[PDB]
Amino acid sequence: SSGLVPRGSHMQFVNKQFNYKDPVNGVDIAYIKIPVKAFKIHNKIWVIPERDTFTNPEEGDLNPPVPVSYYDSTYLSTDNEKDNYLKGVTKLFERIYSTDLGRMLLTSIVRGIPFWGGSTIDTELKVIDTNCINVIQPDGSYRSEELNLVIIGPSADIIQFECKSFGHEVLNLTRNGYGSTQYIRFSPDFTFGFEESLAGKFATDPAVTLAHELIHAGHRLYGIAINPNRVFKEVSFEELRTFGGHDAKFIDSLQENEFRLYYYNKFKDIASTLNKAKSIVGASLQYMKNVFKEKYLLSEDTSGKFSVDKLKFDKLYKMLTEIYTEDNFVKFFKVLNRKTYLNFDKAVFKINIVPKVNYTIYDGFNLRNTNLAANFNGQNTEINNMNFTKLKN
Ligand SMILES: N=C(N)NCCC[C@H](N)C(=O)NO
Ligand SMILES: [Zn+2]
Numbered sequence: 001s002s003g004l005v006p007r008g009s010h011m012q013f014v015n016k017q018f019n020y021k022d023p024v025n026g027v028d029i030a031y032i033k034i035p036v037k038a039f040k041i042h043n044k045i046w047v048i049p050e051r052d053t054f055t056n057p058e059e060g061d062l063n064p065p066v067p068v069s070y071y072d073s074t075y076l077s078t079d080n081e082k083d084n085y086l087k088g089v090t091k092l093f094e095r096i097y098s099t100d101l102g103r104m105l106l107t108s109i110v111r112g113i114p115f116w117g118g119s120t121i122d123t124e125l126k127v128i129d130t131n132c133i134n135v136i137q138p139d140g141s142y143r144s145e146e147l148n149l150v151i152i153g154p155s156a157d158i159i160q161f162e163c164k165s166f167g168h169e170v171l172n173l174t175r176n177g178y179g180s181t182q183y184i185r186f187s188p189d190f191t192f193g194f195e196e197s198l199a200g201k202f203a204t205d206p207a208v209t210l211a212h213e214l215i216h217a218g219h220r221l222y223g224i225a226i227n228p229n230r231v232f233k234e235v236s237f238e239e240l241r242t243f244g245g246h247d248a249k250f251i252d253s254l255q256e257n258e259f260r261l262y263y264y265n266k267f268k269d270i271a272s273t274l275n276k277a278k279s280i281v282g283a284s285l286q287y288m289k290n291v292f293k294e295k296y297l298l299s300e301d302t303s304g305k306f307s308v309d310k311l312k313f314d315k316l317y318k319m320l321t322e323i324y325t326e327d328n329f330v331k332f333f334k335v336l337n338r339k340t341y342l343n344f345d346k347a348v349f350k351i352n353i354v355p356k357v358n359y360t361i362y363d364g365f366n367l368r369n370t371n372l373a374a375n376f377n378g379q380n381t382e383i384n385n386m387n388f389t390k391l392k393n
Contacts, residue, residue: 002087003356004094013097013106014041014090020049020083026138033134039086044110044148046133047089049082051075051153052185055164059155069157070348070392075189076153087354088188089151095207095361096214099332105214105324111295112148112221115178115270116288117171123278125288128173130166131181149217150183159348161186161209163216177223177266177296184213191388193347193381194338202379203349203388205335205364212326215242222296222320224263235341243341244325264313267296271306274298335364336376349381350389358387 004011011017015028018039022029028040034055038048053060062073076085096102118126132144154160165180167173173180188210191203219225219238226238240247274289286304293300297312330337353359360367365378365387372378381388 001356002091002354003360004087004091006361011090011094013093016041018086018090020079020086024136026136031136035136038133041090041093042110044113044146046147046150047086048150048152049076049085051077052155052183055152055166055183056155062156064156068159068345068393070159070190071156072158073156075158076187081189084352084354085153085188089186089210091353091359091361092188092207092210095364096211098361099329101324101328101332102211104319105211105218108218108320108324109148109214109221112179112218113146113291113295114148114173114180114221115223115292117173117178117273119281121279122273123276125277125280125285127282128168128180130168147181148221150181151186152183154185154187158187158190159192161213163213163220165220174220174223174225175227177263177270179221179223182217182220184210184217186210186213188353189351190391191349191351192345193349193390193393194343194345196336198375201381202336202376203351203365203381204337205333205379206351206353207333207364208326208329208335208337211329212242215324215326218320218324222316223266224317224320226259239341241321242325243327244322245327245340247327247341248322248325260314260317263317264308264310267308267313270296271298271308274306333364335366336379346393347381347390348392350391351387 004017018029024030024037030038032038032046036048036050038046040046051062053062064071076082093106097106114128114131116125116127118128127146132146134142135145136142163182163184165174165182171178188206191206191209193201193203196202226236226241228236228238230237237251240251274292277285277289279285280288292298293306297309297316298306299309299312300306359365362368363373365384366372366376367378372384378384378387
C-alpha cells in the first residue's frame with residue numbers, strides 16, 4: 001500500500017521496513033548525537049527525520065530573517081509527518097536502486113569511507129572525529145560509529161537543499177582526496193515547478209533531486225570537489241559538472257586535465273601515507289590499510305607496497321565526475337526535467353509520494369496502464385492536479 005516491494009519478498013537497498021514508532025533498539029533504530037532518534041537504512045547511511053537545527057550554530061532556529069525561498073516552522077513536527085518523511089526517503093533510495101546507474105552510484109558512496117588522516121604524527125593512522133556520530137546503545141552507553149552519509153530535514157528555508165560537511169583546521173577534506181561525512185538537507189514532501197512545451201506546467205521528480213545531492217556526496221567523499229571560487233558570472237563548475245549534459249561541456253577540456261592531474265597527485269600523497277605508516281590508534285594497521293586500498297582502487301606489490309594505477313584512477317575519476325550526473329538519471333528514469341541547470345524555478349508544491357496510488361518505484365508519478373502513463377501526464381500539475389498543491393510563486 002506504500003508499494004516498497006514491487007518485486008520479490010524484501011527491499012534491496014534499505015534494510016528494514018521501518019515505522020517511526022518502532023522501539024529504539026541500539027543497532028538500526030537509536031538516539032544519536034553529532035539528542036535525536038535516527039534510522040539506519042544501510043551500512044554507512046542514516047536518516048534523521050528532523051528539521052536541521054544541528055549542523056550549524058547560527059541556524060538553531062526555524063525563523064525567517066528572500067529570493068527563491070519558502071518557510072513554515074511547523075513542517076516535520078508531528079510523528080505522522082516524521083513517519084511519512086522516513087517512508088518517503090526509503091522509497092526514493094529504492095527507486096534510485098532500481099536503475100543500473102543508481103546501483104553503481106550507491107555502491108561507490110558506501111565504499112567511499114572518509115580517510116583516517118587524523119594523527120599529528122606522520123606514521124600513525126587515526127580517525128577524524130567529525131566523520132562519526134554517537135549512538136546510544138541498548139544498555140544506555142554511547143559508542144562512536146563511523147558513517148559516510150546522513151539524510152536530514154531542511155533548516156529554516158525548507159527548499160535550500162544541499163550537501164555539506166564539517167571542516168578541519170588545517171586540511172581541506174573535500175579537495176585533498178580524503179573525504180568527510182556528508183550531510184544532505186532534503187525533503188521528499190516538496191518539489192519544484194518548471195515550464196515546458198510539448199506552454200506546460202510540470203513538477204520535478206524528487207528521485208532526480210535526491211540523486212543530484214547524492215552526486216555531490218560522491219565528489220566530496222573521494223575528496224575531488226572543485227574549488228567553489230571557480231564560477232560563471234552565479235553558477236559554480238561543481239554544479240555544472242553535477243548536472244552534466246551539454247552544460248558540463250563548457251568546462252574546457254584543458255581545465256579538466258589540470259583538475260584530474262591535481263587529484264591524481266593527491267591520491268599519490270595518500271598511497272605513500274599508507275606506505276609510511278607504522279602504527280594505528282583506536283583492528284590491525286594492515287586491515288585498515290586494505291579498507292583504503294579497496295576505496296581508492298590502489299595496486300599492491302610483493303613488498304605489499306601500494307601505488308596508484310593510472311587506468312584505475314581514470315576509471316573511478318570518470319565514473320564519479322562524468323557518468324554519475326543528473327542528466328543521466330533523467331535518461332534512466334524516463335521522466336521530464338529541466339534541460340539546463342540555468343533554469344529558473346517558478347513554483348513550490350506540497351506532495352505525498354508514500355501511497356502507491358500516488359507514486360511508484362518503477363514509474364514515479366507517470367503510472368503505467370493509466371492516462372498518467374502518456375506525455376508525462378503524472379508530472380503535469382494541472383492534469384494530475386490531485387497530486388500537487390501550490391504554496392509559493
Ligand atoms: N530549486 C532547487 N532544486 N533547490 C535545491 C538545490 C539548490 C542548489 N542550487 C543546489 O543545486 N544544490 O545542490
Ligand atoms: Zn547542486
